[PDB]
Design a protein around this ligand. Structure first.
Ligand SMILES: CN(C)CCCn1cc(C2=C(c3c[nH]c4ccccc34)C(=O)NC2=O)c2ccccc21
Ligand SMILES: [Cl-]
Ligand SMILES: [Cl-]
Length: 273
């Protein structure tokens, strides 16, 4: 049973992702996050190998939750008459990247490099597992403040990774690419790279680069903060208007700006502790 296995704590938050409570696993006091979503509020449904009807979020989480990674793992899930309940890892202490940047302002490039690298490795993991997140952004990244490790959250907008065109999108608009704005069409990997460019800009400038559709499709990138020439180049490459002009993940990680990355623990010691 659900209620015998987990001690539920206060509400952490709620929104389009359902209602998430702090909890602990009774067996070993493991900190967890307990996410509830009403069945009537689930738009995207899938099926598990054994043929169970579940939210697509569960399908995608199962696919990425094997072994260690920079994704928050699904530990268990339960079906109730009118809802699903997901048990997820919970770092402690933790802060999401949106709150971190809001509080501390634009990040030093050494810290942005460490964080961005970790996000790249996490998104590679997802893609390797056949999962497209589709909502990569500061709010969907948790920082484990003691370990210096970033963790991807909220697969509620995700999809199975495919090589053909996507014509649906329920992620965050300002992180959405110009081909979506113009044509309601995108491909998975190149749209992901766009969102990563937005994220990197957000890290080093302290705010996102575009607010309105006309800026997104204009793709003129103006920098509000001092950012190194190498970092500006990478950002501008990720934010190329034409999807085919954007770097691959390999190209991003081989970029001069991405060299000499700090390990998570040294990141924590230098920047977080
Ligand atoms: C802007 N926010 C706070 C969006 C949070 C999105 N979000 C965080 C979480 C998670 C956690 C949260 C960690 N702090 C939170 C505050 C509010 C809501 C959730 C959390 C967590 O520890 N593990 C998580 O998976 C989450 C889980 C499923 C779906 C969406 C989720
Ligand atoms: Cl809900
Ligand atoms: Cl690597």
């Amino acid at each position: 049973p659900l209620e015998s296995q987990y001690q539920v704590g206060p509400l952490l938050g709620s929104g389009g992702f359902g209602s998430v409570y702090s909890g602990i696993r009774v067996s070993d006091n493991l900190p967890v996050a307990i996410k509830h979503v009403e069945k009537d509020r689930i738009s995207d449904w899938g099926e598990l190998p054994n043929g169970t009807r579940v939210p697509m979020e569960v399908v995608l989480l199962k696919k990425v939750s094997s072994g260690f990674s920079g994704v928050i793992r699904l530990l268990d899930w339960f079906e109730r008459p009118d809802s699903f309940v997901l048990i997820l890892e919970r770092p402690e202490p933790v802060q999401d990247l949106f709150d971190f940047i809001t509080e501390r302002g634009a990040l030093q490039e050494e810290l942005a490099r460490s964080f961005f690298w970790q996000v790249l490795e996490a998104v590679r993991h997802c893609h390797n597992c056949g999962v497209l997140h589709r909502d990569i952004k500061d709010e969907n990244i948790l920082i484990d403040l003691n370990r210096g490790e970033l963790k991807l959250i909220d697969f509620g907008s995700g999809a199975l990774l495919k090589d053909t065109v996507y014509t649906d999108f329920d992620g965050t608009r300002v992180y959405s690419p110009p081909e979506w704005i113009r044509y309601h069409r995108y491909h998975g990997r190149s749209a992901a790279v766009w969102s990563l460019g937005i994220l990197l800009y957000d890290m080093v400038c302290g705010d996102i680069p575009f607010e309105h559709d006309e800026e997104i499709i204009g793709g003129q990138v103006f920098f509000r903060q001092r950012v190194s020439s190498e970092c500006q180049h990478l950002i501008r490459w990720c934010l190329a208007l034409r999807p085919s002009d954007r770097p691959t993940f390999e190209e991003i990680q081989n970029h001069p700006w991405m060299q000499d990355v700090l390990l998570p623990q040294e990141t924590a010691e230098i920047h977080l502790h």
